[PDB]
Design a protein around this ligand. Structure first.
Ligand SMILES: C[C@H]1CCC(=O)N1Nc1ncnc2[nH]c3cc(F)ccc3c12
Ligand SMILES: [Cl-]
Length: 167
């Protein structure tokens, strides 16, 4: 048992809710919140801008030190950093950005990072400003992640479409 509340169960291990991931994280304080990161950990907008804003820019300060030491992430890759006031840890995962021409095939590799964590609160990778089809992202999530994932979908119209079209 865990404290995630109000989720619809899609599969044995995937759950979904119409929610603002920032407010969800602040309420639950999960072990892991997933950020929709880019390879530079520049948290300017979308989910990343919102998570970073909620940390009062502490996420960005930590991220800049990470990049200065390690260089950029790979598309499809991830790193574990602090969750600050939102979670114990933040798993920064880079899904392909279709608006940059990145290979959508890398979305499966991106979701594989979730399997290193038993339970996660996460957005749909490559959705939103990353330009992929969220219906597709949900399908890849369900067919790739084997650990327990609680998906937060900000947009109510999208949430309803994702549920109603789910196979
Ligand atoms: C990933 C895409 C897929 C459909 C959707 O709603 N997306 N975004 C979110 N998903 C969950 N929580 C969020 N909080 C946010 C705060 C922001 F400033 C901007 C975006 C989000 C957001
Ligand atoms: Cl977004």
């Amino acid at each position: 048992v865990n404290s995630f509340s109000g989720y619809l169960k899609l599969t044995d291990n995937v759950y979904i809710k119409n929610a603002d991931i920032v407010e969800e994280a602040k309420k639950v304080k999960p072990t892991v919140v997933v950020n929709a990161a880019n390879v530079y950990l520049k948290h300017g907008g979308g989910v990343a801008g919102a998570l970073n804003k909620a940390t009062n820019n502490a996420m960005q300060v930590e991220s800049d030190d990470y990049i200065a030491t390690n260089g950029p992430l790979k598309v499809g890759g991830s790193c574990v950093l602090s969750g600050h006031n939102l979670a114990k840890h933040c798993l920064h995962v880079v899904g392909p950005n279709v608006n940059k021409g990145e290979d959508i095939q890398l979305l499966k590799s991106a979701y594989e990072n979730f399997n290193q964590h038993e339970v996660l609160l996460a957005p749909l990778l490559s959705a939103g400003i990353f330009g992929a089809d969220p219906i597709h992202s949900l399908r890849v999530c369900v067919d790739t992640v084997r650990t327990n994932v609680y998906l937060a979908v900000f947009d109510k119209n999208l949430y309803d479409k994702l549920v109603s079209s789910f196979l």
